Design a protein around this ligand. Sequence first.
Ligand SMILES: *[C@@H]1O[C@H](CO)[C@@H](O[C@@H]2O[C@H](CO)[C@@H](O[C@@H]3O[C@H](CO[C@H]4O[C@H](CO[C@H]5O[C@H](CO)[C@@H](O)[C@H](O)[C@@H]5O)[C@@H](O)[C@H](O[C@H]5O[C@H](CO)[C@@H](O)[C@H](O)[C@@H]5O)[C@@H]4O)[C@@H](O)[C@H](O[C@H]4O[C@H](CO)[C@@H](O)[C@H](O)[C@@H]4O)[C@@H]3O)[C@H](O)[C@H]2NC(C)=O)[C@H](O)[C@H]1NC(C)=O
Ligand SMILES: *[C@@H]1O[C@H](CO)[C@@H](O[C@@H]2O[C@H](CO)[C@@H](O[C@@H]3O[C@H](CO[C@H]4O[C@H](CO)[C@@H](O)[C@H](O[C@H]5O[C@H](CO)[C@@H](O)[C@H](O)[C@@H]5O)[C@@H]4O)[C@@H](O)[C@H](O[C@H]4O[C@H](CO)[C@@H](O)[C@H](O)[C@@H]4O)[C@@H]3O)[C@H](O)[C@H]2NC(C)=O)[C@H](O)[C@H]1NC(C)=O
Ligand SMILES: *[C@@H]1O[C@H](CO)[C@@H](O[C@@H]2O[C@H](CO)[C@@H](O[C@@H]3O[C@H](CO[C@H]4O[C@H](CO)[C@@H](O)[C@H](O[C@H]5O[C@H](CO)[C@@H](O)[C@H](O)[C@@H]5O)[C@@H]4O)[C@@H](O)[C@H](O[C@H]4O[C@H](CO)[C@@H](O)[C@H](O)[C@@H]4O)[C@@H]3O)[C@H](O)[C@H]2NC(C)=O)[C@H](O)[C@H]1NC(C)=O
Ligand SMILES: *[C@@H]1O[C@H](CO)[C@@H](O[C@@H]2O[C@H](CO)[C@@H](O[C@@H]3O[C@H](CO[C@H]4O[C@H](CO)[C@@H](O)[C@H](O)[C@@H]4O)[C@@H](O)[C@H](O[C@H]4O[C@H](CO)[C@@H](O)[C@H](O)[C@@H]4O)[C@@H]3O)[C@H](O)[C@H]2NC(C)=O)[C@H](O)[C@H]1NC(C)=O
Ligand SMILES: *[C@@H]1O[C@H](CO)[C@@H](O[C@@H]2O[C@H](CO)[C@@H](O[C@@H]3O[C@H](CO[C@H]4O[C@H](CO)[C@@H](O)[C@H](O)[C@@H]4O)[C@@H](O)[C@H](O[C@H]4O[C@H](CO)[C@@H](O)[C@H](O)[C@@H]4O)[C@@H]3O)[C@H](O)[C@H]2NC(C)=O)[C@H](O)[C@H]1NC(C)=O
Ligand SMILES: CC(C)CCC[C@@H](C)[C@H]1CC[C@H]2[C@@H]3CC=C4C[C@@H](O)CC[C@]4(C)[C@H]3CC[C@]12C
Ligand SMILES: CC(C)CCC[C@@H](C)[C@H]1CC[C@H]2[C@@H]3CC=C4C[C@@H](O)CC[C@]4(C)[C@H]3CC[C@]12C
Ligand SMILES: CC(C)CCC[C@@H](C)[C@H]1CC[C@H]2[C@@H]3CC=C4C[C@@H](O)CC[C@]4(C)[C@H]3CC[C@]12C
Ligand SMILES: CC(C)CCC[C@@H](C)[C@H]1CC[C@H]2[C@@H]3CC=C4C[C@@H](O)CC[C@]4(C)[C@H]3CC[C@]12C
Ligand SMILES: CC(=O)OCC[N+](C)(C)C
Lengths: 268, 216, 155, 51, 283, 186
Amino acid sequence: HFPFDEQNCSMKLGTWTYDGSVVAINPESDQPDLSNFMESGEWVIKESRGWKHSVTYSCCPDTPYLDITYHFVMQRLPLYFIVNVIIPCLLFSFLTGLVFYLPTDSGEKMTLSISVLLSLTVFLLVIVELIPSTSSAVPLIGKYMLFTMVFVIASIIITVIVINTHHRSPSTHVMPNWVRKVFIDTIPNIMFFSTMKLIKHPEVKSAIEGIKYIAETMKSDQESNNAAAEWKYVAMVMDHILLGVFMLVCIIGTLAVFAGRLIELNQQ
Amino acid sequence: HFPFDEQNCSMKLGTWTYDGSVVAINPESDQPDLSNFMESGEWVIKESRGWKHSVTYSCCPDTPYLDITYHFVMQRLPLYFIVNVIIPCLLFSFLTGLVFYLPTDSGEKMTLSISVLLSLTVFLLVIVELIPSTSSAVPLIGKYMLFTMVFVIASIIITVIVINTHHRSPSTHVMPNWVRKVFIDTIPNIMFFSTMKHPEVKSAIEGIKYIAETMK
Amino acid sequence: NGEWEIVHRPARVNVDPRAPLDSPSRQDITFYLIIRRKPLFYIINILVPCVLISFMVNLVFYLPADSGEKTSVAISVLLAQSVFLLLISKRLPATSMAIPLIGKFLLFGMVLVTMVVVICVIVLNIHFRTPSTHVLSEGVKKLFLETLPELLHMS
Amino acid sequence: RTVDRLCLFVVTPVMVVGTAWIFLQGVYNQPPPQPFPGDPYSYNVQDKRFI
Amino acid sequence: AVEVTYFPFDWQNCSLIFRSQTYNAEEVEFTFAVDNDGKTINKIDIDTEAYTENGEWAIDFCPGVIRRHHGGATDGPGETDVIYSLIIRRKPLFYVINIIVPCVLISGLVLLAYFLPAQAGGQKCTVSINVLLAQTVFLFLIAQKIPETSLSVPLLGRFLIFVMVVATLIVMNCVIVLNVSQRTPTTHAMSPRLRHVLLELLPRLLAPEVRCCVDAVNFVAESTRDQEATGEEVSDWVRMGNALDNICFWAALVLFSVGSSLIFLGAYFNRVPDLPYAPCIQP
Amino acid sequence: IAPCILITLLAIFVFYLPPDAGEKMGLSIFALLTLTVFLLLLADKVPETSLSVPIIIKYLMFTMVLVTFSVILSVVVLNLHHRSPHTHQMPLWVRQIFIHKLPLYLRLKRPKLPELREVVSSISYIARQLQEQEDHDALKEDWQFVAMVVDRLFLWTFIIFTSVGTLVIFLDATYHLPPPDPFPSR
Ligand SMILES: *[C@@H]1O[C@H](CO)[C@@H](O[C@@H]2O[C@H](CO)[C@@H](O[C@@H]3O[C@H](CO[C@H]4O[C@H](CO[C@H]5O[C@H](CO)[C@@H](O)[C@H](O)[C@@H]5O)[C@@H](O)[C@H](O[C@H]5O[C@H](CO)[C@@H](O)[C@H](O)[C@@H]5O)[C@@H]4O)[C@@H](O)[C@H](O[C@H]4O[C@H](CO)[C@@H](O)[C@H](O)[C@@H]4O)[C@@H]3O)[C@H](O)[C@H]2NC(C)=O)[C@H](O)[C@H]1NC(C)=O
Ligand SMILES: *[C@@H]1O[C@H](CO)[C@@H](O[C@@H]2O[C@H](CO)[C@@H](O[C@@H]3O[C@H](CO[C@H]4O[C@H](CO)[C@@H](O)[C@H](O[C@H]5O[C@H](CO)[C@@H](O)[C@H](O)[C@@H]5O)[C@@H]4O)[C@@H](O)[C@H](O[C@H]4O[C@H](CO)[C@@H](O)[C@H](O)[C@@H]4O)[C@@H]3O)[C@H](O)[C@H]2NC(C)=O)[C@H](O)[C@H]1NC(C)=O
Ligand SMILES: *[C@@H]1O[C@H](CO)[C@@H](O[C@@H]2O[C@H](CO)[C@@H](O[C@@H]3O[C@H](CO[C@H]4O[C@H](CO)[C@@H](O)[C@H](O[C@H]5O[C@H](CO)[C@@H](O)[C@H](O)[C@@H]5O)[C@@H]4O)[C@@H](O)[C@H](O[C@H]4O[C@H](CO)[C@@H](O)[C@H](O)[C@@H]4O)[C@@H]3O)[C@H](O)[C@H]2NC(C)=O)[C@H](O)[C@H]1NC(C)=O
Ligand SMILES: *[C@@H]1O[C@H](CO)[C@@H](O[C@@H]2O[C@H](CO)[C@@H](O[C@@H]3O[C@H](CO[C@H]4O[C@H](CO)[C@@H](O)[C@H](O)[C@@H]4O)[C@@H](O)[C@H](O[C@H]4O[C@H](CO)[C@@H](O)[C@H](O)[C@@H]4O)[C@@H]3O)[C@H](O)[C@H]2NC(C)=O)[C@H](O)[C@H]1NC(C)=O
Ligand SMILES: *[C@@H]1O[C@H](CO)[C@@H](O[C@@H]2O[C@H](CO)[C@@H](O[C@@H]3O[C@H](CO[C@H]4O[C@H](CO)[C@@H](O)[C@H](O)[C@@H]4O)[C@@H](O)[C@H](O[C@H]4O[C@H](CO)[C@@H](O)[C@H](O)[C@@H]4O)[C@@H]3O)[C@H](O)[C@H]2NC(C)=O)[C@H](O)[C@H]1NC(C)=O
Ligand SMILES: CC(C)CCC[C@@H](C)[C@H]1CC[C@H]2[C@@H]3CC=C4C[C@@H](O)CC[C@]4(C)[C@H]3CC[C@]12C
Ligand SMILES: CC(C)CCC[C@@H](C)[C@H]1CC[C@H]2[C@@H]3CC=C4C[C@@H](O)CC[C@]4(C)[C@H]3CC[C@]12C
Ligand SMILES: CC(C)CCC[C@@H](C)[C@H]1CC[C@H]2[C@@H]3CC=C4C[C@@H](O)CC[C@]4(C)[C@H]3CC[C@]12C
Ligand SMILES: CC(C)CCC[C@@H](C)[C@H]1CC[C@H]2[C@@H]3CC=C4C[C@@H](O)CC[C@]4(C)[C@H]3CC[C@]12C
Ligand SMILES: CC(=O)OCC[N+](C)(C)C
């Protein structure tokens, strides 16, 4: 649950070379003396308690071995990690989804996504130094950072797919019928949809045929423009769906990571 | 003057509990003994000297205590800081001014300027680590870093202004007379570059005229 | 230990036959610890981000040349790998017996990303050719516009 | 575009296979079954070497 | 214990507590030494012959107090100690030049994105997101300097987080303006509400040969007319984006200036309190 | 060393990137930023004395100077490429050197009734405008060909200087052998 974790640290004290039949130890009080305890800026001691234990081994029934164990239940103060670690990661997670509202024709989607990735990579240098290096379990803050890295990389992959779709033309591709039915017809109906979708002379003869050539050329160009516009519209629809999905993923991932432990701490 | 700084490090030595009237200390020589001194790869000892002093303290108002202060005046060897710190800063500072030779139509002005700023930002960490948190003075290397930073910031601001001027639409913004007077007429003199009956037939005729006017 | 698990823990009495009896080096008792690292921390915090970012460079081949953002993606991946190498350089000794496995992967990925940047440069150079600059021979057309597209099953 | 697709089909499998090889060296790296090579004894209390 | 709230424009209260390790107050007691004039020196003494000034920390006050406690019968023998309170003031000159001023300038660069064009070669996002990358580098720097306690947040960290949030919101603003400016009729329908708000309400607030050739010529004329109309609609979208950029610049400037001013005026009013003690060092 | 070599090859290959891609600045300057990262990496390992400079530091500063010069020369090439044909007239010496002499030595071969009266006037105007468009295109192509020639010259220059400098430094490092005798005669 780091940095919202609670620890239980003990101090076991005993006479090293004397057993209970020669030297007996008893607690002075049921609790450690905290009357002269200096305030900690990182931990709050919730509970403290000293227990005496006596162990008799089956081999030696007349020789007890004694100890006194003082345990402290302590709660970390999480403000430093909240400010320095969690908030920047949340900002990068939020910035991840904004690429899907940027137009492809801007020519800056890759800039935005890659710069968010580079910022996260630099932030790794803070994460590694401020996170425990144990392998008993994954820190919760580490789970959040891995989540953010994975989904910015996914955003980059899907953005590359969207940019590839935007630039398709009849000179390279032909729209499948399923693409049309899924993206131009069905999806926008569950969306806002406020979007579209004498003469013998060689020279006079050459001039007439040339004028017809220009007219045919721009007819073909307009047809290709319409097909490219259909591809661009498909790309825009995918971008809107992905914007919604990624913002939802950001919110739900943040909550699914932190809210369980935060609600548990609120109950206490 | 860091990294071209000279320091004067002292060593005050004296008998703690004996005053000059019971124990007297005298220097063996006017200078510290440097016969067995190992050469330093970072400092050169320009001067060294030992002075005897008799000082009265508040604790013992009537008994002056003696001390010998040995001071060393040393000069830093700046080659390491020149090569490792200053030269990259020179490189970025020189690259700062080149955005104004980069055309706007390239669409790369902000890339160059902001990336130079990023490099200097990455370099600011080293200069931060190398000096004390002391308010007596700003180091010369710190002054140079701040100057380069402000230089790049001003370059970015003026580059944004230039880009804004370049893409100014004719329709939205008419050219003011002061702009045309200064930048197009006055300034270019000091520098040197150039100075800048079926209805269907009627429908076709009107269409050709429309194309001509559109290209007008 | 949070990072090490004990696999073997033998003890031995070692006697050097060649050493003299009156030497302190004749006899010793040695206790050995064979320990395995638990790599979960390094996996989660280094290897998955580094491997994913390195694999991300292959997306440039699916980026159209008209985007004007291929080499930027590739060189940025190289910069990220450099940051990872900076991270890893502080955690291991600078020994010469072997290249670490993570170091092997980082060097391999950086060489591959450099090759990818070169490929992107060449592809962009080919893309922006015009009649006024270059001549498009018929063999080049026959190969790259009818033969390889059929072989590669491009749309 | 054709050159780009060929590079996609050549470079990507090479990187995948190289990464797989490099990390498979480490994944199946294990300490030896016995503490000392050439010595079959396990040095464990489950096998006491009685006199 | 370091009170971090106004770091690096902070002042601290460091205690020096002296006591007998062995004896209770009844066995050994303390009194302050008296000067040559017979005045009790209830403070840290400073001899001008044997004092050096710390470059970063100035000592404003240093009173001393002899405390007696546990004198009640329920506590047993009385105990005593002597506590000196060094009230020290940081000299923040280094943090101002090396960290704060560069951070402020680079954070303020994000406001320039509103003045770049909302077109392909404008590079608004390239400016703002890279400012966010530079701020992340500054976060790496600041993590190595600030204290690592959680009783409050240092002012340096608060300012950095604030400018990062502002830069993120301005990145979102740039994305929205780029989205609005680059709408084309073939993929976006004109919105009369947004147009009326942005462009009207808001400035106020603040033979077959002959026939076939004629057909081709008419086709060309109509194609040119359609192209002109599409260009006109693109112009309206661009103008609406420009108006949005214009007002959003003022909003962002007000937010940035007000927040930075409040954060640093918090430091301005954090001065060593006017205590009734004599100064530690005589002038 | 290997990352430095890789970044150096990318610095060389910037001169093969076409100006119309709008990507030379990004590649060159990010190569420089990567070199800065490796300077940070080396900062934790090098001796901090000032009697001499390590050879690896000389190599790292040589690479940084090379990448900086790649940035500068790429800016020069982009300035030549996007030169406005009408505000800038090509000097005759530029034409002679960079369009006629240099391309041969660089193996760069450049390829190759009032209504009727008003109709006539409109057609003549359109043809005249297309003629001026062609002339502007020709001048722009001349400037762009000069930019291409200059880019190829800088590519060859960078290859030569890089190879020579890297060879010199690597041979200086390689032949530094330990003493055959512990106490050499000096
Ligand atoms: C954080 O971590 C710490 C651990 O570091 C943890 O501390 C534990 O706290 C719990 C309390 O919540 C402790 O449990 C209590 O222990 C009391 C002391 O137990 C010892 O002493 C007993 C008394 O010995 C004398 O009397 C008996 C006859 O009664 C006699 O035979 C003896 O010779 C001697 O004269 C002794 O009986 C007891 O032995 C038991 O336990 C050991 C060890 O498991 C076992 O080997 C024995 O067989 C036997 O079961 C032991 O030596 C104890 O008095 C107390 O009992 C009360 O509660 C129980 C609840 O089940 C009731 O049944 C009982 O009637 C009493 O009301 C209770 O068991 C525990 O020992 C602490 N552990 C340590 C190591 O300190 C904190 O709780 C943690 N904090 C968190 C999580 O918040
Ligand atoms: C973890 O690390 C520990 C060390 O800290 C490893 O323990 C070492 O394991 C190896 C392999 O099990 C041991 O080597 C073997 O030693 C035996 C015994 O040899 C002894 O007795 C011989 C007879 O008196 C004597 O000749 C030997 O001395 C010779 O060799 C040493 C080598 O250092 C040399 O210094 C001397 O001058 C001699 O030349 C020694 O005192 C030996 O029988 C084994 O034989 C192997 O090698 C021979 C060829 O040389 C070959 O013919 C055999 O078939 C066989 O392969 C072998 O040398 C070593 O002694 C241990 N070191 C200790 C205990 O300190 C441990 O294995 C590591 N665990 C891992 C990696 O899992
Ligand atoms: C690593 O670092 C160590 C030092 O820490 C290096 O060791 C030094 O190496 C040099 C060169 O090998 C040595 O200088 C040579 O010394 C020999 C022997 O001189 C000694 O014996 C003499 C006996 O007759 C005696 O007279 C000498 O005394 C004089 O010189 C010493 C010098 O320290 C001086 O202190 C005295 O006051 C005297 O003046 C001394 O005890 C000598 O034969 C060599 O002569 C060479 O140079 C002369 C130049 O005139 C030339 O004529 C000869 O032909 C010959 O070429 C030379 O002076 C030095 O003494 C070593 N220092 C030590 C051992 O402490 C070591 O070499 C380094 N290793 C590497 C690989 O770099
Ligand atoms: C680095 O810092 C050290 C201090 O830490 C400086 O050292 C000072 O050096 C100057 C000399 O340059 C010293 O001044 C000389 O002191 C001598 C001894 O003074 C003591 O003893 C006499 C006799 O009992 C007492 O009267 C006196 O009060 C002291 O107790 C004097 O004999 C010298 O006098 C001669 O020089 C002066 C100046 O030229 C003449 O006017 C005299 O007539 C006479 O010729 C002289 O005053 C000084 O005391 C040193 N201070 C300490 C604390 O050691 C270094 O100079 C400094 N380095 C640099 C380069 O900044
Ligand atoms: C720098 O740090 C020092 C040390 O922390 C501060 O000096 C202490 O300041 C606190 C107040 O913040 C003082 O505590 C107050 O003492 C008053 C006097 O009673 C004390 O002295 C008598 C002497 O006979 C004892 O019998 C008695 O037990 C006390 O020790 C109290 O009247 C005050 O009471 C208030 O607080 C308590 C809770 O703590 C409430 O229960 C009361 O109702 C009431 O509200 C208080 O306890 C302390 O004595 C000072 N220590 C010294 C001077 O040695 C400096 O002020 C600080 N400097 C700054 C911040 O500028
Ligand atoms: C693309 C996906 C797979 C992410 C990249 C995974 C890379 C980094 C590989 C390299 C070595 C791999 C590890 C090697 C061994 C094991 C086996 C078992 O103990 C669980 C998984 C685990 C621990 C692997 C997890 C994934 C791993 C860390
Ligand atoms: C190819 C890319 C993703 C590089 C990383 C490959 C990693 C994720 C793969 C390659 C081979 C995999 C191993 C193959 C087989 C097994 C045995 C089984 O008990 C599951 C874990 C384990 C040990 C796998 C762990 C993950 C692994 C190491
Ligand atoms: C996100 C933007 C708006 C704000 C950025 C600065 C952040 C870090 C600031 C804004 C408000 C601040 C909080 C305001 C008040 C308190 C109560 C105090 O007893 C402990 C610190 C604490 C809990 C602050 C922590 C830092 C804080 C959360
Ligand atoms: C030439 C450019 C492009 C490459 C980078 C500059 C390099 C070669 C320069 C910068 C500073 C220089 C060093 C500065 C001073 C000294 C001390 C003396 O013993 C002469 C050589 C030596 C050690 C120089 C060697 C060359 C050097 C390292
Ligand atoms: C007598 C005695 O111990 O004095 C110590 C202080 N000093 C060295 C300044 C006189």
